Amino acid sequence: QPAWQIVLWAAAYTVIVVTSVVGNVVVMWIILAHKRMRTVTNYFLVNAAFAEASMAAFNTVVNFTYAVHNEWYYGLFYCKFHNFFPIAAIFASIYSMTAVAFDRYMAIIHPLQPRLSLTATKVVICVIWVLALLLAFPQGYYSTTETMPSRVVCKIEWPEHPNKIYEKVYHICVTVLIYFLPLLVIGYLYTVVGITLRASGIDCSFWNESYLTGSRDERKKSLLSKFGMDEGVTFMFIGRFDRGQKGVDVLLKAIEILSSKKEFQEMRFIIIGKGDPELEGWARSLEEKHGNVKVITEMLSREFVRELYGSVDFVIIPSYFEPFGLVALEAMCLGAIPIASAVGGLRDIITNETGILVKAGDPGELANAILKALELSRSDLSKFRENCKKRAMSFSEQVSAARKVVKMMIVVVCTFAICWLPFHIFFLLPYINPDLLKKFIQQVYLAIMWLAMSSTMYNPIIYCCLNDRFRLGFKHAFRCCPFIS
Ligand SMILES: Cc1ccccc1-c1cc(N2CCN(C)CC2)ncc1N(C)C(=O)C(C)(C)c1cc(C(F)(F)F)cc(C(F)(F)F)c1
């Protein structure tokens, strides 16, 4: 191999070393030196930054030179460290990222359950390092320098056994512990969290009362006149007509219960949806029997639905099953006060001060909640509507912020997975097809090892790109340079 290629490879590995050391040291300064940054998540990130900066500072140069010149000149202790540290460092790093993913999963999926205190996170960090050092110990213990037979090499001398079963089992278990298992765990955690956050998202640039015109009373009166009705307290339902799911059968039973009451004269109902023909026929018979009931089975534009949310008094959401409840957020953003089953995301979003909640599947409690809404309508409802809108906005703000942090950690984990896949494939291939034929293998090995080692420099760059606080910290760290002011 020509020397100019060696100089280029040496420059590339040097870029890894300097980028990883500078970026991870600045990350540790950004977290440790600023009291607002001292959180559970940032403590695990500091631990990962320490492990990655250490592996880059203390392994990369000799890994390169030994790959290029296959004689070991660096002593016995460094031979042990060379085979010991990378395993412990990658273990500590990836399990710190796994702890971060678990902390986010707990905060979003089980908010009531206690999470780690800061001292508990320091204990977990020490435990992670103890397990990492114990896992890496055998490689350190069996490493030795020896002529093979005439020139010195650093080699792991495993106890001779049944066709090297001990090294094979150890290599497989390490590859599982530092790659496949943590990736599967983090992938489960962030799949559940990312789906939950995206399904709890709403477009506030559309579902927004600012795009309606006039007073709410003029809008409601114009809407009821468009449906041919006299003014009254207006309840709206929108959803599929089915049994055991979206609850239109519960609402129809509740309307039948209310129809004998005198208060029924003051109510108006708009039932929007399609589905089970029996439920459609039941709704149409209620629509013909009663002049204060209207049914819409045709599909509606989201603009017309936004107009409805901004005009009706209440939106009834009698779901048996509602994991995320974006429909509650749409109603509350437009000032419609929700009347909903206390299940799932509805129970999470709506509060006593921002809506009326009922037991799912109970037409009588839904009818009583509708009568309660009618009692409330005699008074001004402006404050109630303001509370609904404020709750929907603040819930949406938290969702977007969590989505940004989760997107950053997903980019972190995907980058780790990409950087280490070729490395583990290169070392697992002999078991599958033992033909590592040169075929430019040293160039392939230098490239694969460069990608693997470069994994240690990306996280500070990812933090600077995808997190405002880390970008501000990097600006503060590099203020001297003629860019930042
Ligand atoms: C034991 C092991 C675990 C995981 C992946 C590969 C192996 C492995 C297996 C075999 N075997 C089995 C297959 N067959 C070829 C016979 C010999 N030989 C050499 C291996 N390696 C590369 C190492 O031990 C050392 C130098 C300690 C190392 C590990 C990592 C790690 F963190 F990824 F683990 C990262 C780095 C660094 F990035 F710094 F370069 C260096």
Side-chain angles (χ1 to χ4, degrees), residues 47 52 80 93 236 249 254 281 383 396 413 416 424 443 460 476:
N47 189 51
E52 291 163 9
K80 298 185 175 291
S93 174
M236 170 196 171
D249 48 329
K383 287 165 169 193
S396 295
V413 184
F416 178 95
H424 294 305
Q443 297 78 340
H476 196 358

Side-chain angles (χ1 to χ4, degrees), residues 55 59 63 82-84 86-88 90 139 156 158 167-168 170-171 174-175 178 420 423-424 426-428 430-431 436 445 449 452-453:
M55 194 181 82
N59 290 102
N63 289 350
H82 154 94
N83 288 316
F84 171 95
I87 293 173
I90 299 309
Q139 288 225 336
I156 310 170
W158 295 98
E167 61 211 84
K168 293 176 178 36
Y170 176 85
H171 173 209
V174 172
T175 304
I178 73 161
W420 287 102
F423 187 91
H424 294 305
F426 178 94
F427 283 101
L428 293 169
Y431 304 135
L436 271 186
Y445 178 69
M449 184 167 62
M453 302 298 298

